[PDB]
């Protein structure tokens, strides 16, 4: 299921909604979630999950191809925590 | 925190779509994704991330409070690998 296959399936179900509308709708939602995490705010969708931001301390990186030490700044990293309903339905092994 | 309420309102002032379908699309958005994950399908969202599914085995654990060693039962979780595009836009973020 890709970004495109995600719009096709949703458009197939919703017939009373233009296919073109569902296309831009999905693209705008993703861009909205990407902009929110960019500002510093976290996302929290009940039943789905939540997108937080974990801090990374600056350390002298390395090059796993040559072996040269590269400087690294702080920088944050997007993290996703599966929701209650998401974990249960996905987990096929009790 | 970004909620389905704010997402729906955005689609109303960006696409000019009624809050009704704007709220129905946000729901079916996460719903369809959850239907793919539970069915055992990878969700690759370009310019965002990739919801993976890894089957973890039963590994040793315990009671953080007391310390009673209890084996964590094996189960299939749902990880999320953020794309390089997203990371480059969150690298210079700030908790606000």
Numbering used by the authors:
A (entry chain J): 1 to 94
B (entry chain I): 2 to 97
Kindly provide excerpts from the paper associated with this entry.
The site-specific recombinase (Int) encoded by bacteriophage λ is the archetypical member of the tyrosine recombinase family, whose members carry out such diverse functions as chromosome segregation, chromosome copy number control, gene expression, conjugative transposition, gene dissemination, and viral integration and excision. All tyrosine recombinases use the same isoenergetic phosphoryl transfer chemistry and sequential strand exchange mechanism to execute DNA rearrangements via the formation and resolution of a transient four-way DNA junction, or Holliday junction (HJ), recombination intermediate. Int is a heterobivalent DNA binding protein that binds to high affinity 'arm-type' DNA sites via its small amino-terminal domain (NTD) and more weakly to 'core-type' DNA sites, where DNA cleavage and ligation take place. The Int subunits within a recombinogenic complex bind and bridge arm- and core-type DNA sites in patterns determined by the accessory DNA bending proteins IHF, Xis, and Fis.
